[PDB]
Design an enzyme around this catalytic site. Structure first.
Site, mmCIF file in Angstrom:
data_model
loop_
_atom_site.group_PDB
_atom_site.id
_atom_site.type_symbol
_atom_site.label_atom_id
_atom_site.label_comp_id
_atom_site.label_asym_id
_atom_site.label_seq_id
_atom_site.Cartn_x
_atom_site.Cartn_y
_atom_site.Cartn_z
ATOM 1 N N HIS A 200 -6.027 9.128 20.483
ATOM 2 C CA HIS A 200 -5.111 10.207 20.120
ATOM 3 C C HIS A 200 -5.797 11.236 19.229
ATOM 4 O O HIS A 200 -5.684 12.445 19.460
ATOM 5 C CB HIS A 200 -3.877 9.635 19.423
ATOM 6 C CG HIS A 200 -3.174 10.615 18.535
ATOM 7 N ND1 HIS A 200 -3.489 10.775 17.203
ATOM 8 C CD2 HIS A 200 -2.170 11.486 18.791
ATOM 9 C CE1 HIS A 200 -2.712 11.705 16.677
ATOM 10 N NE2 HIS A 200 -1.901 12.152 17.619
ATOM 11 N N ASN A 201 -6.516 10.777 18.202
ATOM 12 C CA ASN A 201 -7.199 11.716 17.321
ATOM 13 C C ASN A 201 -8.433 12.322 17.971
ATOM 14 O O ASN A 201 -8.867 13.401 17.559
ATOM 15 C CB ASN A 201 -7.595 11.033 16.009
ATOM 16 C CG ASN A 201 -6.411 10.417 15.293
ATOM 17 O OD1 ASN A 201 -5.262 10.709 15.610
ATOM 18 N ND2 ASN A 201 -6.686 9.574 14.310
ATOM 19 N N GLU B 196 -6.904 15.095 19.576
ATOM 20 C CA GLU B 196 -6.536 16.034 18.521
ATOM 21 C C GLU B 196 -7.731 16.876 18.098
ATOM 22 O O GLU B 196 -7.606 18.093 17.909
ATOM 23 C CB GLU B 196 -5.956 15.279 17.323
ATOM 24 C CG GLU B 196 -6.131 15.990 15.990
ATOM 25 C CD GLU B 196 -5.843 15.087 14.807
ATOM 26 O OE1 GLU B 196 -4.889 14.287 14.890
ATOM 27 O OE2 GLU B 196 -6.567 15.180 13.794
ATOM 28 N N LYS C 18 -4.420 4.944 19.330
ATOM 29 C CA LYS C 18 -4.372 5.907 18.233
ATOM 30 C C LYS C 18 -5.730 6.569 18.033
ATOM 31 O O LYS C 18 -5.808 7.762 17.713
ATOM 32 C CB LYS C 18 -3.899 5.236 16.943
ATOM 33 C CG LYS C 18 -4.172 6.067 15.698
ATOM 34 C CD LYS C 18 -3.045 7.072 15.483
ATOM 35 C CE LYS C 18 -3.442 8.182 14.518
ATOM 36 N NZ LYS C 18 -3.383 7.761 13.095
ATOM 37 N N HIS D 89 -38.544 2.676 38.772
ATOM 38 C CA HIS D 89 -37.162 2.232 38.627
ATOM 39 C C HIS D 89 -36.456 2.047 39.960
ATOM 40 O O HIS D 89 -35.308 1.586 39.965
ATOM 41 C CB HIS D 89 -36.366 3.241 37.794
ATOM 42 C CG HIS D 89 -36.937 3.502 36.435
ATOM 43 N ND1 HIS D 89 -37.925 4.439 36.212
ATOM 44 C CD2 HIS D 89 -36.646 2.968 35.225
ATOM 45 C CE1 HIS D 89 -38.222 4.463 34.925
ATOM 46 N NE2 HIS D 89 -37.463 3.579 34.304
ATOM 47 N N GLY E 204 0.790 -1.217 0.000
ATOM 48 C CA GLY E 204 0.000 0.000 0.000
ATOM 49 C C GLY E 204 0.825 1.271 0.000
ATOM 50 O O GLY E 204 1.285 1.731 1.050
ATOM 51 N N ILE F 99 -3.035 0.319 3.707
ATOM 52 C CA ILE F 99 -4.160 0.464 2.794
ATOM 53 C C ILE F 99 -5.382 0.916 3.579
ATOM 54 O O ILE F 99 -5.503 0.671 4.785
ATOM 55 C CB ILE F 99 -4.415 -0.856 2.040
ATOM 56 C CG1 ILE F 99 -4.971 -1.917 2.983
ATOM 57 C CG2 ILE F 99 -3.128 -1.362 1.411
ATOM 58 C CD1 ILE F 99 -5.572 -3.067 2.251
ATOM 59 N N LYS F 100 -6.296 1.592 2.888
ATOM 60 C CA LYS F 100 -7.443 2.200 3.543
ATOM 61 C C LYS F 100 -8.407 1.132 4.061
ATOM 62 O O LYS F 100 -8.453 -0.002 3.573
ATOM 63 C CB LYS F 100 -8.169 3.144 2.586
ATOM 64 C CG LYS F 100 -9.092 2.454 1.597
ATOM 65 C CD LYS F 100 -9.887 3.465 0.790
ATOM 66 C CE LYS F 100 -11.314 3.585 1.302
ATOM 67 N NZ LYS F 100 -12.114 4.496 0.440
ATOM 68 N N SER G 124 0.980 7.851 13.584
ATOM 69 C CA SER G 124 0.573 9.245 13.579
ATOM 70 C C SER G 124 1.763 10.104 13.189
ATOM 71 O O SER G 124 2.916 9.749 13.445
ATOM 72 C CB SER G 124 0.029 9.688 14.944
ATOM 73 O OG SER G 124 -0.294 11.068 14.930
ATOM 74 N N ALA H 138 0.457 4.834 -0.612
ATOM 75 C CA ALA H 138 -0.190 6.127 -0.778
ATOM 76 C C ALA H 138 0.839 7.219 -0.531
ATOM 77 O O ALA H 138 2.033 7.014 -0.767
ATOM 78 C CB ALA H 138 -1.382 6.271 0.167
#
Ligand SMILES: NC(=O)c1ccc[n+]([C@@H]2O[C@H](COP(=O)([O-])OP(=O)(O)OC[C@H]3O[C@@H](n4cnc5c(N)ncnc54)[C@H](OP(=O)(O)O)[C@@H]3O)[C@@H](O)[C@H]2O)c1
Ligand SMILES: NC(=O)c1ccc[n+]([C@@H]2O[C@H](COP(=O)([O-])OP(=O)(O)OC[C@H]3O[C@@H](n4cnc5c(N)ncnc54)[C@H](OP(=O)(O)O)[C@@H]3O)[C@@H](O)[C@H]2O)c1
Lengths: 468, 467
Positions: free
Chosen positions: A185-186, A189, A182, A453, A8, A74-75, A128, A10
């Site tokens: 992490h985003n 971000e 990860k 409840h 892959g 790869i995606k 990342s 890219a």
């Protein structure tokens, strides 16, 4: 024979191939379409580096040394499983598959177990840094097979971002813990980007700062405690000039920024596992609301928003540094929600993550790289079982010193009808987490009224129901 | 018999008593027969005849064609392979109606599975508890219009009827019935959070005792905030404990988790990209409350000073500013709720009529209000209404009462009172009604580090910049 294989090519795997070759290893390569395999060796011999190119996936598998180690970039899609299935045809016991794409962690846990049903060991590694971090030094977050991490670490240690001595790589844990870190992490971000955008509108619309003055304040904040990759690039962005008009480039970009999927995932985990992440809710709300741009134009024409006329005797001295303290306060709170979620899921998934070193690998290469994460890493190594991070003694003193600044930022924006949901949620989150008694006694009393409840009492055990 | 019902549990129990009160006859089945035993005991107590059965085979055959079966058993694997087993005795033209609170995607599997046998399926959400059973529910049947056609009159006369116009409507195709019920309680979660924040603003800023709070809530129930939750809150806050010398609400431990219902609608909001901040704050308050022993440890480290209000703070009309502020947040809360309904309706191609959805909610609900009748009036006046506070009725209410929301948020922020639902509601309004938002800086950032393309103010095409 080659040391590592890479599927892959890219903009992300190409430069990782160049990095792997730049650090004394040499790599085999395959792409579904061979023009990008063509272009990669073009750049290899340009930089005086050697990269081996292959047209079928079979020739490169036979051109690796055992144990064969292959990286996929790869995606996310059925393509990941058509590659993994076809790699499995040629792979034998002890061989390593390393997925570097940002994939939903549940998908990985499924593929780790299918691949070891052939004793093919799987390394779900989140990467990342983008395509700068790829070429020169990223932040690797490999999780899964401890065996596979040991055979490949040397490639990761010398291709990652070096913070002094420390390579930005660590064994995250078992299973799909690599993608979960990860993913979180985003999430942090997304929240960091939202908090910066709200600080940008406080200065521009209350202190009425032009775009260059904003670039200077960000270039002055980047000198400090919030020294980060994102803060420095905003200073560059706000100063950038358009080449079609004489305006700042950021002022000609249309305000539609949707979610690209990854960051959306962390709010799904937060909701279904019951761990609140309010700073991230505001971040996803801002992105989702922007997508309805032609509805927001119709809405403003009905609810015309007036230009911000600041009171002449409103005091604005130290407001630029109150926003400084407020932004730093909201970042401590933002990371607190992210790491509390990580800690909790670590205990439910039995991953026993080491948040001290996760913070340490994130000090370089990644989008959120900041000196702030060195304080976090040092905090968890001082207390390895810390759940919330502002309960640390230094961080608690930072909150108590800077929380009034967050109150005054929220107060000033609230009065002038400027929306800063991430700032408001961050201070709302702190006030509720630190309050022993919350108004959910009335909620529990309401639920018992109409639904039976039942509720629990202060002074006694057992569940009780009352006819009100 | 006219209708059969195979799983009554504690809930279908009370549904049989109503259905027979209005000239119809019901068959009944439970997994355990102690509760089917108890059902007939209350049936003959209230002077009506109800049929009881022990096997599933005997009850199916005692209705007139086409035979229609209702299930009200809890969500789980038992219901879906049961659907393999009910298919055994049922033939074509039979009507199966699931009345349990079920995940709408779970239903979508069964409507299409049943149409693979030419048995049409109705996913119908029911609300009202078991009071709604005896006197009036809110029926939300969706899926096959043919299947809604054979049970239609049974629902029209057994729901909560506001005058003569029934609180029943063909919601739409597929699992649209369950989605309405899910989104309905999403607005219910948000209404409770907004009320609970009004309760702590008065208690800790105006120092209202529990009796003063009950009076203001009983005085809000007489006005524009006429609703079921406001009325029971006045009763709850006034109720006195019989175990101690305190009010009962002050002795209830503040841990209220999510029972699933409200949690689901936030998943749909996130996954479909429809923001629901009022609902986000509601689940945040519930989820934080469960960490009760973390909130105690956090408070000991972050000692909270007593709320000492400025002696020269102006607080006259604060009680009426909070009224308008709370009312503003209800308009905003329903706006996000109906926008999510609108968006999913077009993504699922359900063509829901939210004017009738709002009118279905005039009775039976926890969210009952005269307020949602004005909502129905909005959609009947403009069937293409995108956001509900953009309507002329609500827009003038928003423009008159939004300043009250500003000062309420200002006052709570000043004295460190957390109102996430109020803050989110005012943040949501200011961004939804803003043509330009600071997300140009975000798009510039993503193009910086991730090389994601962007679009421009004055031109078409996708652009990338070497910053
Ligand atoms: O992701 P993106 O939006 O960022 O675009 P992208 O960078 O061009 O895609 C990155 C990688 O994903 C591969 N890919 C995408 N869809 C694929 C599919 N159906 N089958 C096999 N490989 C596929 C691409 O193969 P190709 O390079 O052959 O397109 C490429 O190697
Ligand atoms: O709490 P709650 O008050 O809501 O409980 P509940 O009312 O007593 O249970 C409601 C209904 O769901 C049925 N049910 C629950 N779990 C089931 C399972 N594994 N298999 C088949 N039926 C099941 C029950 O069968 P039963 O009536 O036999 O309990 C009952 O009819």
């Amino acid at each position: 024979m080659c040391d590592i294989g890479l599927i892959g090519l890219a903009v992300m795997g190409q430069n990782l191939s160049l990095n792997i070759s730049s650090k004394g290893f040499k790599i085999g390569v395959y792409n579904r379409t061979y023009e990008r395999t063509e272009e990669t060796m073009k750049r290899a011999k340009e930089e005086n580096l050697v990269v081996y190119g292959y047209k079928t996936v079979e020739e490169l598998i036979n051109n690796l040394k055992k144990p064969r180690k292959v990286i996929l970039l790869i995606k996310a899609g059925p393509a990941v499983d058509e590659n993994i299935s076809n790699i499995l045809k040629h792979f034998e016991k002890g061989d390593i598959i390393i997925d570097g794409g940002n994939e939903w962690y549940i998908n990985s846990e499924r593929r780790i177990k299918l691949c070891k049903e052939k004793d093919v060991e799987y390394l779900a590694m989140g990467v990342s840094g983008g395509e700068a971090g790829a070429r020169y030094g990223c932040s690797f977050m490999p999780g899964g097979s401890k065996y596979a991490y040991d055979c490949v670490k040397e490639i990761l240690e010398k291709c990652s971002a070096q913070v002094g001595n420390s390579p930005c790589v660590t064994y995250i844990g078992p299973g799909s813990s690599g993608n979960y870190v990860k993913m979180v992490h985003n999430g942090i971000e997304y929240g960091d980007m939202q908090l910066i955008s709200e600080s940008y509108v406080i200065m521009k619309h209350i202190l009425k700062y032009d775009n260059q003055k904003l670039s200077e304040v960000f270039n002055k904040w980047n000198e400090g405690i919030l020294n980060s990759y994102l803060i420095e690039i905003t200073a560059n962005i706000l100063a950038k000039k358009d080449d079609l008009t004489n305006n700042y480039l950021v002022d000609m970009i249309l305000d539609i920024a949707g979610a690209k999927g990854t960051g959306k995932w962390t709010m799904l985990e937060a909701t279904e596992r019951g761990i609140p992440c309010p700073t991230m809710c505001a971040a996803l709300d801002a992105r989702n609301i922007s997508v309805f741009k032609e509805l927001r134009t119709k809405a403003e024409s009905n609810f015309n928003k007036d230009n911000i006329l600041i009171d002449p005797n409103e005091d604005l001295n130290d407001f630029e540094n109150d926003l400084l303290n407020a932004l730093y306060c909201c970042k401590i709170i933002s990371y607190t929600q992210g790491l509390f979620l990580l800690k909790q899921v670590s205990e439910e998934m039995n991953w026993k993550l080491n948040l001290g070193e996760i913070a340490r690998i994130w000090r370089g290469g990644c989008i959120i790289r900041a000196v702030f994460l060195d304080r976090i890493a040092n905090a968890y190594k001082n207390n390895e079982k810390l759940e919330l991070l502002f309960l640390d003694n230094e961080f608690s003193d930072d909150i108590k010193n800077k929380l009034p600044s967050l109150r005054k930022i929220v107060l000033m924006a609230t009065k002038y009808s400027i929306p800063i949901p991430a700032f408001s949620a961050s201070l709302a989150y702190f006030q509720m987490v630190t309050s022993q008694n919350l108004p959910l006694n009335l909620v529990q009393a309401q639920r018992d009224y109409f639904g039976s409840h039942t509720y629990r009492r202060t002074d006694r055990e057992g569940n009780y129901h009352t006819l009100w």
